[PDB]
Amino acid sequence: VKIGIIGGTGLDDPEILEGRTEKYVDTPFGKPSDALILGKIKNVDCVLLARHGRQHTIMPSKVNYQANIWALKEEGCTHVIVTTACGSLREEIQPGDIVIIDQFIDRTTMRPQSFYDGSHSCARGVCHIPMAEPFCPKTREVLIETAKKLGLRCHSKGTMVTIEGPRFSSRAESFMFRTWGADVINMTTVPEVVLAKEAGICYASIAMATDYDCWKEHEEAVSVDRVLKTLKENANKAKSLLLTTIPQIGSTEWSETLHNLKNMAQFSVLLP
Amino acid sequence: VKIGIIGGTGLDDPEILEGRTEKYVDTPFGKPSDALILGKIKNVDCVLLARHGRQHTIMPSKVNYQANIWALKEEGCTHVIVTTACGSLREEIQPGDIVIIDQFIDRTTMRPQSFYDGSHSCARGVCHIPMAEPFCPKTREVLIETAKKLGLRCHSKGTMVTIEGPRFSSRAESFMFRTWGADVINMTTVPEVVLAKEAGICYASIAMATDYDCWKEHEEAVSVDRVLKTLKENANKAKSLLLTTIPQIGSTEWSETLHNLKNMAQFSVLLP
Amino acid sequence: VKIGIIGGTGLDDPEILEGRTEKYVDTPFGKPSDALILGKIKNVDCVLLARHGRQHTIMPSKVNYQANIWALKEEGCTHVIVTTACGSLREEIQPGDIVIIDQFIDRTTMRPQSFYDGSHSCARGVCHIPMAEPFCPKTREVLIETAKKLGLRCHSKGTMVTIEGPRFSSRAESFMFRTWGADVINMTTVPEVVLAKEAGICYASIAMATDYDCWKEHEEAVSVDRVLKTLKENANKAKSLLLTTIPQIGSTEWSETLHNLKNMAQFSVLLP
Ligand SMILES: CSC[C@H]1O[C@@H](n2cnc3c(N)nc(N)nc32)[C@H](O)[C@@H]1O
């Protein structure tokens, strides 16, 4: 196994890896957000990638999701575990809580969601990837059991609505998303989750709630500074969860799980 | 009358027409998906066009809806009847059922939906086309009565949600679409239906359900291979329905219906 | 204070201003829709801008929202009050009624919604603007009290759903939008409201309902001609409301309100 880690806002710390070497790569879809950081957690090979770049320079609409996933695939990653900062759409999901999300609702509009775009020899045909179960259940289960072992406030499921951004939602939108069954809100899960599935990678997401979105009365206003402060306070939780989870993934059996993902990916392609 | 036929996935068979001649055309909006196939059904002139191209090469996001409709308009089509493969969002819409859809919900994001884009001398101004009744009721009624005459399982109405694709929906999305009142799901109805209306064409759609989308428990997973297999099993139904419907359209009175569409189209344009 | 006025469909009359001088400007985001019209209402400096251009030439998808707001910002506008023609999604919002909207739901797909797009030296970084309260409450309150003083049918709140257009909604869409909590429907509020907020401008909207959208039974069909006719009949109301409101804004205290908007705008930017 080899674990890709895509680090989100306030949740991307190279110091998580030992024996670090940076590696700039190129892909048929362009350059990834930043250099790949190759390293290890205990005996497990990992590849860390900052979603928003070295200096947090890249807006969610313009993150190169294709290049990021393709680069991790080419580096040999069998798994991708990510972190993402999000807002809470449910009273029971408190700021600082982790949510091991199991569904999404797409509200993005400007984003390529397939490698198979008719313009790349490396991905020929039309791909219709199944999304009934977008996140790897086995990885999610190890995250859930590990969060429990650590005593962390963690939710075992949740539906992430991904908005285009970069603005936050209106209050009317926040309310509407709750009625649609969304539990947490962010700007990056789609199309990252979709492209991972096309690549035949086991993908899971550690979502960190930083605030209640503006549906909720009598809370502080949603703001960049409040998001960043809450992340600073809680980032250690994601780091511990990754550090403790990854060696357990490394000693689990994956051949069958990975073979089924590979088959799903290859059989989703219509060839001419 | 002259009937344009846009054939969808597994539902585009040139052998439906007699006296066939292929004709490659160009439009101010680019090239259509494939050559126009000119021919006849009994005494009625028809024009068949494969939505996804000769070799099923074109993803739904990149189908040239403008060129397809413009080409059929220029060829003299008064009517466009299409086929489309779709998923079912309702228990009563079984795989293999036909749905004569009467509404849509747009979930597409990347698609031009008007000929009047400010860049074409052939379509000057701003067009705000009415969409309260997107599909031609008279054609729909002939399809419905003909399906009954053939003894086919057919639904007399239905709301198609068109997603951007090319991925299938998440389970959270599938559930949400049901709450919005969607009955079937596909990737091509919008903007095809909109552009037909701008062109003053009577447009109707034969939607063929191939599976229950992933909202439904205890069904096979949604997949390309299962969609194609179900289409192979049921394609004869769409072919018979078209073959039997088209001569009845050819002997019906349309002058008033077509005049009202023409007026609606022309009066929807704001000129400078 | 200096009041930007963006005039919508049938609701853009230069004769509202005295001492008029036209001024064509350029911006880092391109040219605004038309010349800025500098003038006065009583003693208050104003800048009028036709949203759709001189000759109503520009479709809602292609209005340069960035250039319009940037141009008004650069001209020194502290406030932007706009007019917009809309459809009603509620029985109680009758054609001819004004709605002082306080929320939106975005259904647009093709539109830049930030100045901070990574390509402009004038707007560096990533901006995540809060949208819990998208419209300036103090301006809205002056509009509401002024409409009452004028005896006008006016609604003190309302949620605008902005669709991509240029087509009108399907009936299935119209119904769905009501379930989401939308009250009125248009094609221009987003991203205009978002960009104003990024610019630190107090923004409010005078929405004029021209018809019931097609959810409602036993009404005339929605059409361009009917929209324009209803606007012709009711445009005087918006003109009076603006004329009477603007001198009251000009004699109100704004330093604190504007300072808070400025802080919100500047603190929403993540720098590298
Ligand atoms: C630094 S500010 C931008 C970051 O904030 C995260 N985030 C937190 N709370 C919310 C919220 N309520 N709504 C939305 N859309 N995003 C939110 C978002 O995913 C992104 O990672």
Ligand SMILES: CSC[C@H]1O[C@@H](n2cnc3c(N)nc(N)nc32)[C@H](O)[C@@H]1O
């Ligand atoms: C060959 S695989 C792609 C084809 O499958 C049709 N289709 C069938 N079932 C579904 C479903 N459940 N969801 C969605 N989105 N599309 C579906 C779709 O319209 C396209 O024609």
Ligand SMILES: CSC[C@H]1O[C@@H](n2cnc3c(N)nc(N)nc32)[C@H](O)[C@@H]1O
């Ligand atoms: C001249 S025709 C185009 C103009 O009509 C306004 N408008 C009025 N009624 C409706 C309606 N029912 N639905 C939608 N989308 N827009 C509507 C719309 O905002 C634009 O300002």
Ligand SMILES: [Cl-]
């Ligand atoms: Cl939507």
